[PDB]
């Protein structure tokens, strides 16, 4: 048993995914240049905390996605993500990127134990 509160996040990254679907519906693109950070909508679900994708250098392009981390991640290394395509992916190990109750910041490719999640 370790199924983190990805469920709360599933709605957050989703809550973002719509704001993503909208940001595009209002703009048409996210990152404008290599090494830029487009402001993310949701920063917290109900048990997870959300932030903008990884490093500005490796930020969403033609794709909009956010990653959420367990607030109790110390106990739930599990992480989640959800894009505009409403396609989520959960991880079983959160190394880099950023974590809650510590110093969340971004989702930069540094996770392990991940599979496709569907809220």
């Amino acid at each position: 048993h370790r199924s983190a509160n990805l469920r709360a996040a599933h709605a957050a990254l989703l809550e973002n995914a719509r704001f993503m679907e909208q940001f595009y519906a209002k703009k048409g693109s996210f990152k404008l240049t290599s090494t830029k950070w487009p402001e993310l909508p949701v920063k917290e679900a109900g048990g997870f905390c959300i932030r903008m994708s990884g490093q500005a250098k490796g930020i969403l392009e033609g794709k909009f996605t956010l990653k959420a981390v367990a607030l109790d991640r110390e106990a739930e290394p599990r992480v989640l993500r959800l894009n505009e395509s409403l396609t989520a992916v959960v991880c079983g190990k959160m190394k880099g990127k950023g974590s809650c109750t510590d110093g969340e910041e971004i989702f930069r490719g540094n996770d392990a134990e991940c599979r496709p999640f569907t809220g």
Side-chain angles (χ1 to χ4, degrees), residues 9-40:
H10 249 298
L13 299 339
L14 162 274
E15 173 179 293
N16 146 88
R18 56 176 181 168
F19 257 89
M20 297 302 85
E21 263 307 89
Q22 283 295 90
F23 187 89
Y24 175 87
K26 304 146 172 299
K27 272 270 179 299
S29 301
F30 265 71
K31 217 187 57 181
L32 31 58
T33 199
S34 68
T35 74
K36 196 267 322 196
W37 267 349
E39 185 169 86
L40 63 314

Side-chain angles (χ1 to χ4, degrees), residues 5-6 16-20 30-31 48 50 67 69-72 79 82 90 92 101 112:
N5 295 90
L6 311 150
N16 146 88
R18 56 176 181 168
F19 257 89
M20 297 302 85
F30 265 71
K31 217 187 57 181
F48 267 49
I50 304 76
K67 174 147 294 188
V69 162
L71 303 169
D72 320 273
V79 233
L82 192 40
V90 48
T101 176

Side-chain angles (χ1 to χ4, degrees), residues 81-103:
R81 118 174 183 197
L82 192 40
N83 57 33
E84 78 289 77
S85 181
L86 285 250
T87 294
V89 64
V90 48
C91 281
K93 218 304 140 60
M94 207 237 65
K95 314 159 180 176
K97 304 157 283 172
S99 357
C100 321
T101 176
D102 291 279

Side-chain angles (χ1 to χ4, degrees), residues 36-55:
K36 196 267 322 196
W37 267 349
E39 185 169 86
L40 63 314
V42 70
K43 319 113 299 179
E44 180 184 90
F48 267 49
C49 73
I50 304 76
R51 265 293 178 176
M52 202 225 63
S53 173
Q55 27 177 30

